[PDB]
């Protein structure tokens, strides 16, 4: 940090340092411990927020860090979604069903609806980032696709376990594991995807819709996804094939309605 | 005047009971409704680990007397209260002395009616800083501590009241920030949704308005 | 304008010019607002009274020293006592309640039996009906000198009340068209007699449950020995209207008095307890560990004596089994036989 001389470069290096610290916080996860998992997620959210403040301070008209800002925002939102989902899994035992009362666990049902909505929106925003990142290389696109696939995996797990296991006529049985992965991170992500998918199928009908096993498997999937470290790619640091559109036109303006 | 410590809220978010046992008595009193609702109710999880945790919770909260009043508040049938609240809401479309002299169901009825009235007043209006629409939240615990516990129970059992609208209503209460804090503490998963609901009102600083 | 008028009135009242008519009218023009349900009205009335009037409890000397030192104090003392007795149930601040209690203790119209009975009745309503304020006045979290002072004052009031009732002779005209049907004739084991209000009895026993005051305990011990002698039958009262067994110790009061740390109270209460009441009591919370152990011991004795009826009275043995298990985990002694009976209809279940 001391060697640098400019402002935006200093903020960029500081933001990278904070993101690295936040991800090193993610490495403290251990299997089946959910309290420590939520603690680590919260600490990483703190470091990510500091990092994104520094990063959005680094943006300038020359080379505005658009992809980095959006990618970090989506990472923060995904981690926040995981934190809220862990909070709901804890709320299953923290907020017992009302004596008035699969609508028995009304609060849990509504919270899972909100979680599904949030993860669907996150997947849509990751797709929007994918479409916007036209300049990016193949590796960056595959990484963003993996993030979107993680979001869709959590959403589908929520759906199958809670909202409608009857509607879960999934044909996931196939040659998914035989895919040629081009990176260690991608291969680990696909492996955890396959493991979570086969875990969901075994619990499709074996328990009541708001069983403790559903939340257990769900948060196990969350900590399993978060166990592997986030990997950045080329377009985060080095941008190539920079193409834009001037988009001139022929125009505070008014015109006759007849014409 | 006291506020729930951050350690206690983190403990309830993490649902670990040993540190809850290690927690001090006033914080336990603050968080008492959720703890009472935890044990002596349906198992929900039906897991032996949660059974041991419930055993520890029951051991923890046995050493205080207010839980007797809380269980008395829980024993009241909520079907009649649900019908009364719905009928009052459809029809619409001293308080502390009565509070002291009322039993559990009448307490629930009167405070729920007041909360529904304040919610409707806030929703109908444009949120033009309704300073104080009630005077049943005074310093003595008869209007402050038992009232807050009862409000937590009301937010729990008749779930028709969403946490966000209750949160919006509580802002207009004279001493409503404390009620909001303890209510969010008793429902740990609700933090970000109530924050989202509150943040969506007021663009600028309102010229430092009340 | 208002301040100058108030200052002129101050001179017109504090000096010798004060007389019965002016003082009574001025006081009545503000005393009526004390009983008003409006909190602001009573606050303004009390503040105006303090303005007109003017180390331990230095901020309350206006009621202890200034207000009694009035030439016309005796004339309006009954009116002041009545006004405070009406406003004691309306007003809510614990410290103001403490000040009112101390003033009533010092400035009671003791000479008239009716006024003493009415004051005792109102204090009993405070003790019984108002529980949260009672919790504030004797908060175990932060015991204070004021709490001990008001506890001693209440003990003194009740002790002098029972002492005055002891002086009552047999065959007097006390038996008349009593305005309350709750009046009950109390007869002690040692042959003493008195007529009392059951609410005042409840208040007296509740005051004992709070424990001994740190400064003085002679009044507390005297009242305790009068009401609960050792190895002797306790006093019993019979309803004058029907001569039936008066419920001097209802279930809620018994449950409250188990919570008290005094061993004599809990030992006296536990005697001759039915299985349903025993189950209801052990279901409750907030009971100390030693008292819990005594509850379990009495449960064991009941199981050894009449086990067959205990089975029929239990709504759900699962909750009771869990409760005795967690109490044993807490370290409470006894209940092993009761736990064994509960586990009889609880065969082994699936492990994990």
Alpha helices in chain B (DSSP H): 6-14, 17-22, 25-30, 32-38, 48-61, 66-75, 78-92, 95-101, 104-124, 145-156, 163-171, 176-186, 191-199
**C235 Ramachandran zone, left/alpha/beta (phi>0; psi -120 to 50):** beta
Chain C positions touching B94 (Cβ under 8 A) are: 37-39, 90
Can you tell me the distance from the alpha carbon of C322 to that of C306, in angstroms, rounded to the nearest whole number?
22
Q: Closest Cα partner for C328 from A208, A207, B55, B204? A: B55
Distance from CA of C7 to the nearest CA of B (A): 33
Q: Closest Cα partner for A152 from A186, A111, A118? A: A118
CA dist list (Å): C310 to A124, B76, C304: 64, 27, 11
Burial class for C137, CB neighbours closer than 10 Å (0-12, 13-18, 19+): buried
Chain A positions touching B78 (Cβ under 8 A) are: 98-100
Closest Cβ opposite residue B188 in set A91, A211, A212: A91
CB-CB contact of C285 with B64 (8 Å): yes
Give resolution in angstroms. Answer: 3.7
Chain B positions touching A79 (Cβ under 8 A) are: none
Q: Does C285 sit within 8 Å of B100, measured CB to CB?
A: no
B158: contact with A, CB 8 A cutoff: yes
List the subunits that have 3+ CB pairs under 8 angstroms with C: B
Q: Does B62 sit within 8 Å of C39, measured CB to CB?
A: no
SS3 B141: coil
Q: Which two tokens stand for residue C62?
A: 């206006």
B100: contact with A, CB 8 A cutoff: no
Q: Closest Cα partner for C13 from C52, C50, C51, C45? A: C52
Can you tell me the distance from the alpha carbon of A215 to that of A222, in angstroms, rounded to the nearest whole number?
10
Touching status, chains B and C (3+ beta-carbon pairs under 8 Å): yes
Can you tell me the distance from the alpha carbon of C145 to that of A61, in angstroms, rounded to the nearest whole number?
70
Q: Cα C238 to the chain's mean position, in Å?
A: 22
Portion 35-74 of B in contact with C at CB < 8 A: 40, 48, 55, 58-59, 61-68, 71
Q: Which two tokens stand for residue C160?
A: 């002098």
Q: Which two tokens stand for residue B16?
A: 């670990």
Can you tell me the distance from the alpha carbon of A242 to that of A162, in angstroms, rounded to the nearest whole number?
45
Q: Does C132 sit within 8 Å of B62, measured CB to CB?
A: no
Q: What are phi and psi of C187, to 5 degrees?
A: -125, 125
Can you tell me the distance from the alpha carbon of B19 to that of B39, in angstroms, rounded to the nearest whole number?
17
Closest Cβ opposite residue B44 in set A96, A99, A100: A96
Burial class for B17, CB neighbours closer than 10 Å (0-12, 13-18, 19+): buried
Burial class for C161, CB neighbours closer than 10 Å (0-12, 13-18, 19+): buried
Closest Cβ opposite residue A98 in set B14, B159, B193: B159
Q: Does C133 sit within 8 Å of B67, measured CB to CB?
A: no
Q: Which two tokens stand for residue C214?
A: 């740190």
Measured on CA atoms in the order C77, C81, C83, C84, is the torsion positive or negative? positive
Q: Does C92 sit within 8 Å of B140, measured CB to CB?
A: yes
Q: How many CB atoms lie within 10 A of CB B36?
A: 26
Q: Does B14 sit within 8 Å of A35, measured CB to CB?
A: yes
SS3 A16: helix
Can you tell me the distance from the alpha carbon of A18 to that of A23, in angstroms, rounded to the nearest whole number?
9
Q: Does C129 sit within 8 Å of B101, measured CB to CB?
A: yes
Q: What is the dihedral of CA A161, A164, A166, A171, to 10 degrees?
A: -60
SS3 C193: strand
Burial class for C51, CB neighbours closer than 10 Å (0-12, 13-18, 19+): middle
Tell me the residue ranges of DSSP E strands in C210-303.
236-239
Q: Does B142 sit within 8 Å of C133, measured CB to CB?
A: yes
Q: Does C352 sit within 8 Å of B94, measured CB to CB?
A: no
Mutation for testing the B interface, residue in C286, C315, C319, C324 having most B CBs under 10 Å: C286
- Strand-by-strand arrangement of the C193-197 sheet: C193-197, C183-187, C236-239
Can you tell me the distance from the alpha carbon of B183 to that of B163, in angstroms, rounded to the nearest whole number?
9
Chain A positions touching B38 (Cβ under 8 A) are: 93-94, 96
Q: What are phi and psi of C186, to 5 degrees?
A: -105, 130
Q: Does B187 sit within 8 Å of A95, measured CB to CB?
A: yes
Can you tell me the distance from the alpha carbon of C32 to that of C42, in angstroms, rounded to the nearest whole number?
9
Distance from CA of B50 to the nearest CA of C (A): 12
Burial class for A42, CB neighbours closer than 10 Å (0-12, 13-18, 19+): middle
Alpha helices in A95-137 (DSSP H): 106-132
Can you tell me the distance from the alpha carbon of B148 to that of B163, in angstroms, rounded to the nearest whole number?
14
Chain B positions touching C319 (Cβ under 8 A) are: 40
Chain interruptions in chain B, by residue before each (C–N > 2.5 Å): 93
Touching status, chains A and C (3+ beta-carbon pairs under 8 Å): no
Distance from CA of B85 to the nearest CA of C (A): 27
SS3 C37: coil
**C108 Ramachandran zone, left/alpha/beta (phi>0; psi -120 to 50):** beta
SS3 C250: coil
Q: Does C329 sit within 8 Å of B55, measured CB to CB?
A: yes
Can you tell me the distance from the alpha carbon of C302 to that of C314, in angstroms, rounded to the nearest whole number?
14
Q: How many CB atoms lie within 10 A of CB C112?
A: 11
Chain A positions touching B158 (Cβ under 8 A) are: 98, 100
B95: contact with A, CB 8 A cutoff: no
Element at C197 (helix H, strand E): strand C193-197
Distance from CA of B203 to the nearest CA of A (A): 21
Beta bridge partners of C236: C187
CB-CB contact of C273 with C306 (8 Å): no
Q: Does C136 sit within 8 Å of B58, measured CB to CB?
A: no
């Amino acid at each position: 940090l001391t060697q640098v001389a400019s402002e935006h470069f200093y903020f960029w290096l500081n933001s990278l340092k904070e993101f690295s610290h936040a991800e090193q916080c993610l490495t403290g996860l251990q299997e089946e411990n959910y309290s420590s998992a939520l603690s680590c997620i919260a600490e990483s959210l703190k470091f990510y927020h500091k990092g994104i403040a520094s990063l959005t301070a680094a943006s300038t008209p020359l080379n505005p860090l658009s992809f980095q800002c959006e990618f970090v925002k989506l990472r923060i939102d995904l981690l926040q979604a995981f934190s809220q989902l862990i909070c709901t899994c804890n709320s299953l035992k923290t907020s017992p069903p009302p004596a008035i009362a699969l609508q028995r666990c009304g609060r849990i049902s509504n919270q899972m609806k909100q979680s599904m909505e949030e993860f669907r929106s996150l997947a849509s925003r990751y797709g929007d980032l994918y479409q916007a990142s036209f300049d990016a290389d193949s590796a960056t696109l595959r990484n963003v696709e993996l993030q979107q696939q993680s979001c869709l995996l959590i959403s589908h797990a929520i759906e199958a376990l809670i909202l409608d296991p009857e509607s879960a006529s999934f044909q996931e049985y196939g040659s998914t594991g035989t895919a040629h992965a081009d990176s260690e991170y991608e291969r680990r992500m696909m492996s955890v995807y396959n493991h979570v998918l086969e875990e969901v199928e075994s619990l499709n009908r074996k328990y009541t819709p708001v069983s403790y096993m559903h939340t257990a498997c769900l948060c196990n999937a969350i900590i399993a996804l978060l166990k592997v470290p986030l990997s950045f790619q080329r377009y985060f640091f080095q941008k190539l094939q920079s193409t834009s559109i001037k988009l001139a036109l022929s125009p505070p303006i008014a015109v006759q309605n007849n014409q | 005047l006291q506020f729930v410590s951050p350690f206690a809220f983190e403990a309830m978010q993490k649902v670990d009971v040993v540190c809850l046992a290690s927690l001090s008595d006033p914080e336990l009193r603050l968080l008492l409704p959720c703890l009472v609702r935890m044990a002596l109710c349906a198992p929900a999880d039906q897991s032996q680990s949660w059974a041991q945790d419930k055993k520890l919770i029951l051991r923890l909260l046995s050493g205080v007397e207010a839980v007797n009043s809380i269980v008395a508040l829980l024993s009241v049938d909520f079907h009649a209260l649900e019908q009364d609240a719905s009928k009052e809401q459809q029809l619409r479309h001293g308080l502390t002395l009565e509070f002291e002299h009322s039993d559990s169901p009448r307490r629930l009825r009167l405070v729920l009616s007041e909360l529904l009235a304040i919610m409707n007043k806030v929703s109908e209006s444009n949120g033009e800083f309704f300073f104080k629409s009630s005077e049943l939240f005074e310093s003595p615990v008869y209007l402050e501590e038992a009232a807050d516990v009862l409000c937590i129970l009301q937010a729990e059992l008749p779930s028709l009241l969403p946490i966000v609208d209750v949160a919006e209503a509580l802002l207009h209460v004279r001493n409503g920030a404390w009620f909001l804090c303890l209510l969010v503490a008793n429902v740990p998963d609700s933090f970000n949704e109530v924050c989202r609901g509150l943040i969506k009102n007021g663009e600028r600083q309102d010229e430092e308005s009340l | 304008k208002q301040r100058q008028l108030l200052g002129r009135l101050q001179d017109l009242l504090l000096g010798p010019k004060a007389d019965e008519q002016t003082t009574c009218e001025v006081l009545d023009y503000f005393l009526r607002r004390l009983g008003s349900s409006q909190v602001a009205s009573r606050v303004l009335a009390m503040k105006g009274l303090s303005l007109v009037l003017s180390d331990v409890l230095q901020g309350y000397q206006w009621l202890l020293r200034d207000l009694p030192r009035l030439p016309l104090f005796d004339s309006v003392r009954s009116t002041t006592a009545l006004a405070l007795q009406q406003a004691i149930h309306m007003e809510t601040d614990p410290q103001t309640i403490s000040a009112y209690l101390i003033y009533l203790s010092q400035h009671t119209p003791v000479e008239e039996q009716a006024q003493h009975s009415d004051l005792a009745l109102d204090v009993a309503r405070l003790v019984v009906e108002r529980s949260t304020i009672m919790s504030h006045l004797f908060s175990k979290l932060s015991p204070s000198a004021a709490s001990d002072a008001v506890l001693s004052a209440l003990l003194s009031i009740f002790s002098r009340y029972v002492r005055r009732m002891r002086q009552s002779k047999e065959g007097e005209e006390v038996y008349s068209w009593s305005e309350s049907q709750d009046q009950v004739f109390l007869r002690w084991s040692s042959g003493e007699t008195a007529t009392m209000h059951i609410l005042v009895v409840h208040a007296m026993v509740i005051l004992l449950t709070l424990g001994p005051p740190r400064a003085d305990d002679s009044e507390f011990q005297a009242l305790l020995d009068i009401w609960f002698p050792e190895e002797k039958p306790l006093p019993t009262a019979f309803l004058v209207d029907t001569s039936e067994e008066a419920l001097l110790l209802p279930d809620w009061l018994k449950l409250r008095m188990i919570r008290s740390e005094v061993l004599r109270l809990v030992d006296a209460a536990l005697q001759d307890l039915e299985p349903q009441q025993l189950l209801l009591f052990v279901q409750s919370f907030g009971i100390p560990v030693s008292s819990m152990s005594k509850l379990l011991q009495f449960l064991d004795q009941a199981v050894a004596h009449d086990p067959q009826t205990l089975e029929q009275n239990i709504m759900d043995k699962n909750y009771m089994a869990h409760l005795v298990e967690v109490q044993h985990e807490r370290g409470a002694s006894g209940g092993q036989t009761f736990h064994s009976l509960l586990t009889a209809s609880l065969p082994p279940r699936r492990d994990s």
